[PDB]
Amino acid sequence: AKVAVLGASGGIGQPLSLLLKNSPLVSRLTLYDIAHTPGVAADLSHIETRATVKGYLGPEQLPDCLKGCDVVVIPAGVPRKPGMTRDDLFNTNATIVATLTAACAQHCPDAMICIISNPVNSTIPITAEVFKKHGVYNPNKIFGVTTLDIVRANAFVAELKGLDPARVSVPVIGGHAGKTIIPLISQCTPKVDFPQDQLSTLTGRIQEAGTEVVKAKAGAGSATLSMAYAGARFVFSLVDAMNGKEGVVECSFVKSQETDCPYFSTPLLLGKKGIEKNLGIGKISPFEEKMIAEAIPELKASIKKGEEFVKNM
Amino acid sequence: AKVAVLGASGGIGQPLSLLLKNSPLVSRLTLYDIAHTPGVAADLSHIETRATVKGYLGPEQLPDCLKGCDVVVIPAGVPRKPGMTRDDLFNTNATIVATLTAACAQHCPDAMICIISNPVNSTIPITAEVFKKHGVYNPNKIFGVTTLDIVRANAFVAELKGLDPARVSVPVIGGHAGKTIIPLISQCTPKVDFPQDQLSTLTGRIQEAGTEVVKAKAGAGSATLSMAYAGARFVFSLVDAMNGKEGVVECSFVKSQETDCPYFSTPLLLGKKGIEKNLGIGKISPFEEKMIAEAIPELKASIKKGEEFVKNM
Question: For residue A254, how far is the Cα from the chain centroid?
């Protein structure tokens, strides 16, 4: 597949691009940033894998970065500092996302667009209204990558139950910010029973995991190496479903109908043209229910800010 | 295998730790550095793979990081700036390597020791002499990692001849600095015949590649992502050979008797206790035989610089 990374010199951008260069599913990797991209490209081109690597710098090199891309991954944005909410990043990142997605609507409207830029709960309504603004919007091909939450949920349930994390799969629905992260532990594979004490502790741990890494990192950035893994996992899932593999399911914050919310993350069946089928919420426990009901106000609020922004910029 | 990364918060260190975390061959990854290792370990522990991750900060915790390791990888060191040569990093990287390998000689003397720290040609002699001071030198378990020259030689020969890099394997011998990097294109699999001028410029490409990436990074460091890749590839070959995989062959700057030069990189059959058979140089062309001739003085100087450093401090 032909994959572009927009924001390739950043903290997420550089290990993500290595993971992509290493994959045999990638035939061409195009890297964009406003600084340092030639050095990152030169470094990566020395890896003995097939993917051709090309770096681009500055706005006038953006179109050539995007032409013919099947998949575009956007991790561009400033990372949080200890004490900030992800919502505190909106004013600075909304502008980056609006600018780079406009160019995607112009040069690769048919590509799968994967947004990592914080805050996802507002930057995917931004992306969708930019694409609508250029009359090229397709709800089935715009993804808010929430895979880090699923990868966290699986490593944490594995740790606790003594299971191999390769064997654990728990769906996380909602959005990606605090209370909007809803891990459906009732739906986990395998089973796992936990007393509700252990269960509310585990849930909060999954909701606050990014904040603990920002704290742990103490001003040196947020989760980069696990976000690169998670982001690469989402792209690999999308590319081999594009290659015809059946039954590839991944959760993502997407244009939705499943709730009163216009955007919502649920399990999605992926196909040759993006989402083949929205698998919805499924059979949830009463605990899981109430979490969704308390989350929707935060989500409504994060979505309208994103929409509002494009309706005045 | 239980792997320690000393210098884990650095440029090579964090993507190398990512690639080791992502391996099924790794069951425990302990990370060491003087700064930032807690946040790196928190980030990496969220990935859904098996290896358990623990970060260690400061000299007081170095023995804890090392106990029970099978493999120790030492990326620690300052990178070159444009204009600087690899020996300009000798005084700063020699003291780091001496400190860390004295801790390794005491706390995990039986582990495989993989040295990436620049300049390898002098840095492996230091480690040898530190291990000998502590009465625990085993020449078949100490490796100066030159795998990036083989990854680069493979990838350059593959694009030049339109081949698939995955199938190309060219031997690179000597050491890792300028004219000491001797690629043996006669021994490449497959055949890849070149005009001699094509051949000079190809050898030049491989010899000065490290400087090209330093120049291309314009101050932001040297090769980090492809060195992470190469460092990871060597560690995985060493673990498979340790686990019992037959016929694992890798080139490495090792204590040798192939030439009248004390340390030399040549192909190595690896086995359960480290190098099982030193494969030597093989059949060379005139051109390669002359490169060895004119590399031997530079190599002998680097080695004695390394040796005299520990016979003092």
Answer: 10
